Symmetry: C3
Subunit: 101 residues, 3 copies
C-alpha cells in the first residue's frame, strides 16, 4: 500500500471548473467530484471534490490556492484525512502500490 493524503473540498457548485483547473495545475493525478446538499428548506446544492495526494505538501498547496482565491467570497470547507492506496495504475505507477525495495 502507498501512503496518501485525502483532501476534501466542499464548496459552491459555481466554482467547479475553477477548482478543477487548480487541481489539474497542482500535479495531482486526478480527482473525484460529486453533487451534494449542504447546510452551512435551507439545504443548498453544493459540490464535493476528493483528491488523493502522495504528499501532504501537495494537498496544502491545493487547499491554500482554492482558499486564497475564493473563500473570502464563497462558503467552503477543506479538510484532510490519511489513507492508504491499495491499487491505482496512475497514482502508484505501473510497479503498483506494493512494490518491494
Amino acid at each position: 500500500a502507498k501512503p496518501a493524503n485525502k483532501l476534501v473540498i466542499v464548496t459552491e457548485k459555481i466554482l467547479l471548473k475553477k477548482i478543477a483547473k487548480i487541481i489539474d495545475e497542482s500535479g495531482a493525478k486526478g480527482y473525484t467530484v460529486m453533487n451534494t446538499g449542504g447546510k452551512g428548506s435551507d439545504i443548498e446544492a453544493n459540490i464535493k471534490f476528493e483528491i488523493l495526494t502522495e504528499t501532504r505538501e501537495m494537498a496544502e498547496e491545493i487547499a491554500d490556492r482554492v482558499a486564497v482565491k475564493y473563500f473570502n467570497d464563497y462558503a467552503g470547507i477543506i479538510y484532510i484525512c490519511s489513507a492508504e492506496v491499495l491499487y491505482g495504475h496512475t497514482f502508484c505507477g505501473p510497479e503498483g502500490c506494493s512494490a518491494w525495495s
Copy 2:
C-alpha cells in the same frame, strides 16, 4: 489545522428532514447530505458532519440511533480529519495554521 471528527450516517432517505433537525439542534455548524445506493440496489442517504469534539459527534449519534435505528435501517461511523479551511467550522480566527 483544526482537529475534527467526521461523523457519517447512512440511512433511509425518508429520514432526511428528521435527521437534519437533530444535527441542526446539536450545535454542529453544518452538514453535507447526499443521495446514495445500498444493497437491496436501493436509494438511500448519507450525511457527513464535522464536529470539533468526539463528545459532540457521540451525542448526535446516540440521539439519531435511539430515536430511529431500532425502527429504520441505519449505520453510524466516525473517522478522524483535520480542517484546513472553514469559516464556520474554525470561526473567524481561522484553522490554527501553525499548529
Copy 3:
C-alpha cells in the same frame, strides 16, 4: 465503538453490478454506492464504500476487483480507518460497545 476498515473503490460505471457481486461474495455486510465524476470535461464514474471488521477482508475485496478488472478498466482503491458507533448488522445485537 467497533474498529472498522473503510474500503473505497472508484471506477468505471459499467462495472457497478460486477463489483457489487464481489463485495457480496466477500462476507462484507453491505455497501454504499454513489454516482460521481472523474477528470475526463468531467466524466461519470462510480464510488463504493465498504466497511469491514478486518483488514484482510477489505484487501480480499480489493485484490479480487483489481485482478479481474484493473488491467482493462480504470480504477483506484484505497483504505481509511473508521470506528462504528451504531449498526445492528455490523456490530451484532449486543451493539458496538
